[PDB]
Amino acid sequence: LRNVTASGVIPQISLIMGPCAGGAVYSPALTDFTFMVKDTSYLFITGPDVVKSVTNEDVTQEELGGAKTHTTMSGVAHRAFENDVDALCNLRDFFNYLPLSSQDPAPVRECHDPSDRLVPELDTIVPLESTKAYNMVDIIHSVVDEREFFEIMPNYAKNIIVGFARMNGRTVGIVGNQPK
Amino acid sequence: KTFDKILVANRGEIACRVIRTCKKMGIKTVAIHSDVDASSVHVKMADEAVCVGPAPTSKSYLNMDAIMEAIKKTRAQAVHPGYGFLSENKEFARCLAAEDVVFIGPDTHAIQAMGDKIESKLLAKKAEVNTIPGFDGVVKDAEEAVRIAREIGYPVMIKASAGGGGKGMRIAWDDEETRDGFRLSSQEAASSFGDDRLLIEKFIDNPRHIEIQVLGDKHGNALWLNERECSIQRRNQKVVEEAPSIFLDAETRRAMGEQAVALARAVKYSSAGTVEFLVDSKKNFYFLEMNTRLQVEHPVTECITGLDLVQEMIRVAKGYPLRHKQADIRINGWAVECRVYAEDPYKSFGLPSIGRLSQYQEPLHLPGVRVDSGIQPGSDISIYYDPMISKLITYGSDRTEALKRMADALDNYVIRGVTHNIALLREVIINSRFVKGDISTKFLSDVYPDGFKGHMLTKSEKNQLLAIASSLFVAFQLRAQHFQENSRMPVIKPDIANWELSVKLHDKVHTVVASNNGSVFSVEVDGSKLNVTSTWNLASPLLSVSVDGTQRTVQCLSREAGGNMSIQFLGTVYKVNILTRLAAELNKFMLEKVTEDTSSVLRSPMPGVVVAVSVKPGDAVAEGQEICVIEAMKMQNSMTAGKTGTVKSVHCQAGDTVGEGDLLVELE
């Protein structure tokens, strides 16, 4: 009830850093972003013991609810980090993008990257041949402040790119196609 | 006065050089390009351009018939091919002259005259240069090997009458090992390729490669310019040259300059070219070869002679005499040039890389620096062309000023998107043997006998790098705390008195404590006090810092939340992992998991039909190299290699249909 009531009022970020089973698995489904830790975290409703008892299929813990599955195939986890220390270091930097409440404007932070500089690197990225693909990420990185881009779900639905960045100090969200 | 329109038959910085000179002269310049070079710099700088052909040079820059069509289509009057492609192609010059188009470069007589080694040696004998005699006969006896050497000279080489690769070769100086070397080769060589006939000739020790440039005149005149020292090289290609050598005094320069002219005036070389000499440790100069074409080492002599070689070549081709006399040619200072390639210097000294350029900034704000480049940001470098990025030229009044300015230009020279060779250039120019001048044509092979490793830091340099890396780390952490004022939720700046960091370099973990006092960070690195002062503009690719009065320029190439930071320091990229004291103490509890590098196994990322395979087993593969091309849903998808190696097997061929995950090619 609190997780639903808070939606659209304050952002809710969940990082899973271990096993998760039973009813606990639904709070990350109510929060705004879910992150995991590679090969350390799991997210499943029932364990492999129940699965084998119900249906005649064999599965292990990493296959049933591992971080790799949820970031690559089910589309549940937004990003997995290598270990506990790196996960919290990246979480602090992610935190700096978001407002404290929906009543606040997007955060604006000191920026040294001139807002009026040209980017000649863009003029020749897109090929003239219609059947030649190119990497959209080169455009995203060259536009955003100081070439810093926070990519969400890098390994799921690779044909569309979403993430956070800053332009002239202000947090923006970026969505684009990936012709590659 | 001069030509109205000149066509250039080349690409890149050499085409740019001609375009700039023509514009200075008021001459319209026509460029040619391939389909992939259509956006290159020289195409945009030229006044008119014609597309000749596709990406491979054999069909675009060596296609003389398509070029002839472009020459007449634009009503060009003269052609300047630069170097490389068709500069020595006689059939091109013949069919070009047949159409009364002025060719800028050698005529076909000079190209054929030096076509082979026999005519070149005969010219050196006639022009009277050197070409030291050997033994015009076969040595058969045990005493002939020494008796003949006694008549001609001292350092004597014994080699097979025909063959190579150590086919009984030995180096001898005195008579005892000359006799021994011959009889060993004459009795064992018969067991290799069935031939035991030995010849003797004369050799030199620690050679230096020295060039002298000559400007020919159609009226019979010819002048010689200051020499070039070209000893720093890899894979028989030069990388660093110096103009005002060091191995010559005023008399030697005149003596050798006159001989280089004697060669040019005896074949009537009414063009610009180069004569190559080898000098031994005793300052004895021997003829090596005569070159007919503007060299790639012509932008370093100009900085001390004050000439413009392209401007002069165009007037001579029009029919004007040389504008100078020999008494006016002098050394006005010193100039050194470094060639920058898109190559990995670690992989057997210069393995080509493939890629696109994302950041590029030439050091043109520094004094005495001239950058001659054919690229612009958003340029691609590919396997079809020699991976040249630029030639960096630095000059000064003395030898130390030109070298110091070169060191500065290299650290302020931003190349990102490809692998480059700046680390190698930055270390060689500061090598104690290079500064003193004890350089031979095999210099790099003795300095780096196990390959290039990178710049090695000393005690004071490690402390400066740790102080810079730690202060920059904190500078980012402080910038992160400066928010606009939120009237609803006031932000309170953490009152951090000291930053206690654990800084991991190669295999050591150092203790660094930093504090901020405005623009200066007071940093203690394992008990050593350093003060790092800067403006700390975190967006610029070039960060200028002052560490205890020492001026440094560094580049931050990457930064991660996990503490990883890549800093280029003195040309070499160092990987430093900066954790806070707390993170470092807890990080010891993390499992040291080991993963697998699966970059040699190339699988299909997408179902569809394979339409091209660029390889067969044994083919060399660079990182980023296209291997296979799969086309599904009206879209050509290139599959590239993630590893430098060779192909072991091609598992799917063109015409085969593959699914997701199927194995296409296997690399070593």
Query: Which of helix, strand or coil describes residue B174?
Result: coil
Is residue B510 within a helix (H) or strand (E), and if so which, with residue range? strand B509-516
CA distance B532 to chain A (A): 20
Cross-chain CB nearest to B482 (options A110, A124, A131): A110
- Match 């923006």 to its residue by tokens: A172
Please, what sign has the CA dihedral across residues B336, B341, B344, B349? negative
CA distance B649 to B336: 46
Q: Which of residues 159-188 of B touch A (CB under 8 A)?
A: none
Query: What is the Cα Rg of chain A in Å?
Result: 20
- CB-facing half-sphere around the CA of B188: CA atoms within 13 A: 12
Domain boundary among B131, B152, B177: B131
A62–B contact, CB cutoff 8 A: no
Establish whether B549 is an annotated binding residue: no
Contact B378 A121 (CB under 8 A): yes
Establish whether B153 is an annotated binding residue: yes
> What residue spans of B98-217 are helical by DSSP H?
108-113, 117-126, 144-152, 175-188
Sequence-distant (≥ 6) Cβ neighbours of residue A42 within 8 angstroms: A18, A19, A20, A21, A61, A62, A64, A65, A66, A67
CA distance A29 to chain B (A): 26
Same domain, B358 and B259: yes
Same domain, B265 and B138: no
Same domain, B192 and B209: no
Is B289 catalytic? The answer is: yes
CA distance A148 to A145: 6
Query: Which of helix, strand or coil describes residue B504?
Result: strand
Is residue B277 within a helix (H) or strand (E), and if so which, with residue range? strand B272-279
Establish whether B154 is an annotated binding residue: yes
Q: Which of residues 138-177 of A touch B (CB under 8 A)?
A: 138, 141-142, 145-146
Q: Which of residues 590-649 of B touch A (CB under 8 A)?
A: 590-591, 593, 631, 634-638
Same domain, B396 and B416: yes
Same domain, B545 and B611: no
- The dihedral formed by the CA atoms of B16, B18, B22 and B24, expressed in degrees to the nearest 10: 70
Q: Which residues pair with B91 in a beta bridge?
A: none
Please give the resolution of this entry in Å, rounded to 1 decimal. Answer: 3.0
A89 contact residues in B (CB cutoff 8 A): 561-563, 583
How many other C-beta atoms are found inside a 10 Å radius of the C-beta of residue A135? 14
Query: Which of helix, strand or coil describes residue A163?
Result: strand
CA distance A171 to A105: 10
Same domain, B394 and B454: no
How many other C-beta atoms are found inside a 10 Å radius of the C-beta of residue B162? 10
Contact A92 B561 (CB under 8 A): yes
Shortest CA distance to B183 belongs to which of B146, B233, B132, B235?
Answer: B146
A180–B contact, CB cutoff 8 A: yes
Contact B561 A86 (CB under 8 A): yes
Same domain, B557 and B596: no
Choice among B289, B312, B401, B631 that is catalytic: B289
Sequence-distant (≥ 6) Cβ neighbours of residue A149 within 8 angstroms: A137, A140, A141, A163, A164, A165, A174
Residue of B nearest to A125 (CA): B378
What's the order of all strands across the beta sheet hosting B170-172?
Answer: B170-172, B156-160, B198-202
- CB-facing half-sphere around the CA of B142: CA atoms within 13 A: 7
CA distance A53 to chain B (A): 32
Query: Which of helix, strand or coil describes residue B252?
Result: helix
Q: Could you tell me the CA-to-CA distances from B616 to B352, B385, B627, B645 in Å, in that order?
A: 19, 21, 10, 13
**Contact in structure between A6 and A49 (CB atoms under 8 Å):** no
Domain boundary among B131, B154, B178: B131
DSSP string, B320-349: PPPS--GGG----SEEEEEEEESEETTTTS
Contact A85 B634 (CB under 8 A): no
Same domain, B626 and B585: no
> What is the identity of the amino acid at B179?
R
Shortest CA distance to B297 belongs to which of B231, B249, B368?
Answer: B231
CA distance B536 to chain A (A): 10
Domain that holds residue B665: 591-668
Contact A124 B357 (CB under 8 A): no
Shortest CA distance to B196 belongs to which of B170, B161, B148?
Answer: B161
How many other C-beta atoms are found inside a 10 Å radius of the C-beta of residue A14? 18
Residue of A nearest to B38 (CA): A124
Cross-chain CB nearest to A120 (options B377, B480, B583): B377
B377 contact residues in A (CB cutoff 8 A): 120-121
B7 φ/ψ angles, rounded to the nearest 5 degrees: -100, 140
Q: Could you tell me the CA-to-CA distances from B578 to B268, B467, B499, B621 in Å, in that order?
A: 67, 12, 11, 35
Q: Which one of A15, A81, A96, A110 would you mutate to disrupt binding with B, by most B Cβ within 10 Å of its Cβ? A: A110
Query: Which of helix, strand or coil describes residue B303?
Result: helix
Same domain, B404 and B427: yes
Domain boundary among B142, B176, B203: B203
**Contact in structure between B51 and B35 (CB atoms under 8 Å):** yes
Q: Which one of A35, A79, A86 would you mutate to disrupt binding with B, by most B Cβ within 10 Å of its Cβ? A: A86
CA distance B607 to chain A (A): 14
A145 contact residues in B (CB cutoff 8 A): 539
Same domain, B551 and B429: no
Contact B358 A121 (CB under 8 A): yes
Same domain, B91 and B152: no
Number of domains composing chain B: 5
Burial of residue B300 (number of CB atoms within 10 Å: 0-12, 13-18, 19+): buried
Q: Could you tell me the CA-to-CA distances from A165 to A10, A12, A170, B357 in Å, in that order?
A: 20, 19, 8, 22
Same domain, B289 and B367: yes
Q: Could you tell me the CA-to-CA distances from B221 to B127, B214, B323, B507 in Å, in that order?
A: 15, 10, 11, 64
**Contact in structure between B362 and B371 (CB atoms under 8 Å):** yes
CA distance B123 to B111: 14
B593 contact residues in A (CB cutoff 8 A): 39
